[PDB]
Design a protein around this ligand. Structure first.
Ligand code: HEM
Ligand code: HEM
Ligand code: HEM
Ligand code: HEM
Lengths: 141, 146, 141, 146
């Protein structure tokens, strides 16, 4: 469960992300596709080459859903019920992959926010991505 | 894939008693019922909404038989799983777009199905051998992914 | 979440286990130790030979805890609270290990309940063991 | 390893800029803070109740340097990780009783620390080569478990 310190930590870090959220979403996806090629099986309809417009646009959507989760940190299941339905009944992405994207998001954050990515903040962000993942896979069966 | 000689005789001994047609349908069917998200690959199969719809679906049974026929054939080539499954690996990656985690889920369900059919005969040591075999097969089916 | 039908399936399958719980627990553990040897690292102080009394004794403890969760299927986080504290603060078993034991419990039940281990029941049992595992791991961080 | 020459050289060139003392201390310390259950092997290191106490703990720091030192020497045996880390695999299993899953967690933490340190230079292709190294090392460290 997210403690008060975690929520504060997550709000602060994401606040600094600010207008780069979309750029960081896209970079996290690109790192995921390269590092964990099995994840490409879910995007056979995308052009997955460097700088493709599909990856960029998708990076923005992912980043925006996270902004929304951070803003609704105390009420995630409700704020993300629609995305949760989407993943469980249409996309049907195997749960193992959420860990892979989460890790790539952390690496992206670490790479772009050196001063803000302290040990305690690293801990909170990992817990937060794990809760988001839990929520997005809660209706799978 | 470290199968000791005695592990390999255990695996082959038991496999000799399997009805692959029947076990193939049960394993594929149970995969789709226990891990419903795996149904994403089978929308052309028709009705998969309830357990009896899935378990008795003639397309699920025919597909299970095909999957397990290829698996058996692999048990005849335990020293060269990678080579044996190379063209299937490529096909699953490039044409079908199947996340290799699905091969691991199926392996585990196959183990429960074998346990179900054989009872006491599926001893802890026999299970341990089969766990190495299903992991070896999953790894071989994934080796051509890129 | 467990559904009404899941709960019914689990009470029915566990009811047939009855006074075999202990034995099935010990068998689940032996299966786990042999198929996934990395799990032995948590039991360096046990004798792990076939028929070991420590294994039998521990098997019974595991089985009783499962029996208690079945008896309190609508209030599991509270019924398993103490066990949840123990695993998080003292034992500190890595979460991946829970899936390994769950799988071996299912193999054990399948091996002993040929008539009750239908596809629907298998599905409900798997969801049940995953919820138990989630509870036991809920306070880890 | 299945490392490509451009990958091999991406790993090596970056590694030549790494301060092993600082990175080791930071990797092990982050591991204990992000995944607190890993503290179970280090009760005798002292106070680990808070991130500040973990990161400032001199035994955490010294152990981090030792672990990364051994990892460092392993980067010169990429064509033979299994043989380089064999005695270490045995020790981790037989004397220390360390669940190999811990090696995976450290690998991922280590990758996050490299990114934190090198920023722009830790590009997606460079990350991919390191992810392969870190899994390779984890697998070599787990190979002698029984
Ligand atoms: C951090 C957790 C994730 C979040 C917050 C997230 C969020 C989203 C959002 C907002 C959408 C767009 C829905 C729309 O168009 O309105 C989406 C779609 C999608 N996501 Fe998830 N996602 C996550 C993880 C994953 C993972 C791990 C995968 C698989 C590797 C995945 C695969 C997909 C796919 C294939 C689509 C549809 C893409 C398309 O056709 O445009 N997602 N996701
Ligand atoms: C033991 C592992 C498996 C083996 C040996 C295996 C083998 C095969 C074979 C022989 C075919 C027919 C190839 C062809 O049409 O040319 C096939 C097709 C297929 N397999 Fe796999 N398979 C395995 C696991 C899986 C799993 C776990 C999934 C997904 C959950 C899957 C999804 C598919 C799909 C969608 C097809 C095409 C079905 C169609 O004709 O529309 N397979 N597989
Ligand atoms: C289904 C999930 C599990 C349940 C219900 C369960 C239940 C229990 C119970 C009832 C105890 C006894 C504590 C006492 O004395 O009161 C225990 C202890 C213990 N468990 Fe868990 N357990 C589970 C999974 C695991 C797994 C996956 C591991 C690691 C592989 C593990 C490792 C241990 C260890 C090492 C002890 C202490 C044994 C001893 O020193 O006597 N458990 N567990
Ligand atoms: C990159 C992976 C790792 C490598 C290369 C590595 C290497 C080493 C080395 C060289 C030693 C010294 C052994 C000796 O003195 O002969 C050691 C000790 C030890 N390692 Fe690892 N290690 C790794 C990961 C881990 C992790 C993840 C854990 C647990 C979280 C761990 C736990 C230990 C422990 C408990 C000791 C004994 C420390 C003591 O003497 O108090 N190691 N390791």
């Amino acid at each position: 469960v997210l403690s008060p310190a975690d929520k504060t930590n997550v709000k602060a870090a994401w606040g600094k992300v600010g207008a780069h959220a979309g750029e960081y979403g896209a970079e996290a996806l690109e790192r995921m596709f390269l590092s964990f090629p099995t994840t490409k099986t879910y995007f056979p309809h995308f052009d997955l080459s460097h700088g493709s417009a599909q990856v960029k646009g998708h990076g923005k959507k992912v980043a925006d859903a996270l902004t929304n989760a951070v803003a609704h940190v105390d009420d995630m299941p409700n704020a993300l019920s629609a995305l949760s339905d989407l993943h469980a009944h249409k996309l049907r992405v195997d749960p193992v992959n959420f860990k892979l994207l989460s890790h790539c998001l952390l690496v992206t954050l670490a790479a772009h926010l050196p001063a803000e990515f302290t040990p305690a903040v690293h801990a909170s962000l990992d817990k937060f991505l794990a809760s988001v993942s839990t929520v997005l896979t809660s209706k799978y069966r | 894939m470290h199968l000791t000689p005695e592990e390999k005789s255990a695996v082959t001994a038991l496999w000799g008693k399997v009805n692959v047609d029947e076990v193939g349908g049960e394993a594929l069917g149970r995969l789709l019922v226990v891990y419903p998200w795996t149904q994403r690959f089978f929308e052309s199969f028709g009705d998969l909404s309830t357990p009896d719809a899935v378990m008795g679906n003639p397309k699920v049974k025919a597909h299970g038989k095909k999957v397990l026929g290829a698996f058996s054939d692999g048990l005849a080539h335990l020293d060269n799983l990678k080579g044996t499954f190379a063209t299937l690996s490529e096909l699953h990656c490039d044409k079908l777009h199947v996340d290799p985690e699905n091969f691991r889920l199926l392996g585990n369900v196959l183990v429960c199905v074998l346990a179900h059919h054989f009872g006491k005969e599926f001893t802890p040591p026999v299970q341990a051998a089969y766990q190495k075999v299903v992991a070896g097969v999953a790894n071989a089916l994934a080796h051509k992914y890129h």
